[model samples]
Target: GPVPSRARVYTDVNTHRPSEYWDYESHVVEWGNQDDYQLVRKLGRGKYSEVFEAINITNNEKVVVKILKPVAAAKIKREIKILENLRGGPNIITLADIVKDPVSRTPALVFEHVNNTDFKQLYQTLTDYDIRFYMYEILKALDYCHSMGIMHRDVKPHNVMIDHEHRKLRLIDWGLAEFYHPGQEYNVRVASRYFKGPELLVDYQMYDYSLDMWSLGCMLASMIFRKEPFFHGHDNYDQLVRIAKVLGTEDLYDYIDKYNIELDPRFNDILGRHSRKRWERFVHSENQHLVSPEALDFLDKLLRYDHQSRLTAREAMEHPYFYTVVK
Candidate 1:
């Protein structure tokens, strides 16, 4: 725990925008008829929702149908509203419509289908240039969302849908996303453990869009290092320790100290001396093709302990790795 902090960039990006734009709770969804979407096959399931491959009868178009479980109206409003706001923004997933049934009375969200394989298999097939450009596409989505004052709290491979054949990338799963407010305290229980930033691990509440950069860095590191998750932190506590080991315990210590952050009493014993694990060490025949000077440079800029020092999504899009591909 430490003093409050603010985003280094876009501190008050939403201040100029209309209040209604960011107020998701106030959004009243225009519900459509669920019968219009014809289910084809089961896709996936989670505690919150059940997903299916479906077809939009109105236009005979294939789509993904997500039937959400009983949840708070506030949460539903938030996700739907954010989806609506983010439409036509970069690689954002398009929400064709939302529907509900009077008999079951559960709401379902319809999304344009993205024919994608699992990231584990998908990453293996992607060429070096493919990885760079896909990450570049990810940056576009993140940058646009950040510019709109929204933070994708869940930034992981699971949420990023890729159709390799079509060269289409879509940022999905807006359930954990939220509008950003400078210096405003946010829930620490947002992202997955492996992708969590140091600020979240340290219980720093006033974080911002840069949190997503840390997650994105973790995701990229996994690709180049050939690790499913670059930082495979065993648990919530162990997660931060894993990050410390790679980043160097001392630099992490300095970062926390600068902000008056104090580790739990047991952490001093467990977080013993550890020097920085250089990015060069991960190079190997399996992932040698993905490794490059600029890739390492960009990852280094993002995986820092200090959120203030991390590159913004828009800034990351300008990194040498991306410029080489985009320019």
Candidate 2:
């Protein structure tokens, strides 16, 4: 077990708010009428939900209908609670309405539809400035969530809906979001494998909003370096190994020491010694234009091994790289 280290910023965001706001289990959900919403076509199925293109017959506007797969009640309530609390937030996906099937008792969450190009293809066409602007957009959503005492555990490109044509970006998928309670040890098995932070890899559970910062850092690096998934690990254990390969095992040891973290026995064999790779090394003829000094500086701050050292979403918004984007 590691020592308890709360977030440097927004430590008491939830403390200031009433317990009812974050206590999703007790929060009552008001189901809305779905008679006017007609399914248009099947969009796709995620791990836990099915998404469909739907039409609001009354307004004739397109919407995304996400049918909730039978899952944990607590998870459903937490996601709905975050969406309602974070309503009207900057760059956050809007929850249009909630619907429960009359007979099957299944729940469906309706959200505003965005015409998004896949990140694999979309990111390829983006200029360096586009990267900075979108990063600012992402920070806006994260800053809002952190201020609201919530952490979007899933912050990958897949969850980010970007309408490049409209110059709009929205952070989607609130399913993995959770209310931040200080000193609370949450499950480390939360974020996607590629985006999982070092705190999660070392089994440190006292993580806070900084976890999202690390995930965002991974996304930033991937975009700038043109490596989809900057750290390509085969599994959870190898994920740390992959990160360690780039960041160095010594720094990993130093982080373990700082947090008084106990190393998992399984890592003894697989985690071999390695030196830290320089940020400049990642830059090359292919990605030289996008790898600006300011970008690297910002990425360094966000991708620290020590979660406490990682930039807060709000602090990230104030970085010099976003001087133009901020205004």
Worst-scoring 10-residue span by lDDT in model 2: 66-75
Q: In candidate 2, what are the lDDT values of residues 1-327, reduced to their tens digit? A: 567788888888888999999999998899998787899998888777888899988899999988878764337988999999998999999999999845436788999999887766777889888889999999999999999999999999889999998988999989999999999999998979999999999999999998999999999999999898899999999999999999999989999999899989999999999999999989899999898889999999998999888888888888989886746
Each model's number of backbone clashes? Answer: 0, 0
Give the Å shift of residue 217 in candidate 1.
0.5
lDDT, candidate 1, at 128: 78
Model 2 lDDT, full chain set: 0.90
Best by lDDT: 2
Q: How do the residues 205-256 of candidate 1 rate in per-residue lDDT, one tens digit apiece? A: 8889989999999999998889988999888888989998899998998988
The best candidate in terms of TM-score:
2
Least accurate 10 contiguous residues by lDDT in model 1:
67-76
* CA RMSD per model (angstroms): 1.5, 1.3
Candidate 2, residue 158: CA error in Å? 0.6
On the 0 to 100 scale, the lDDT of residue 79 in model 2 is: 91
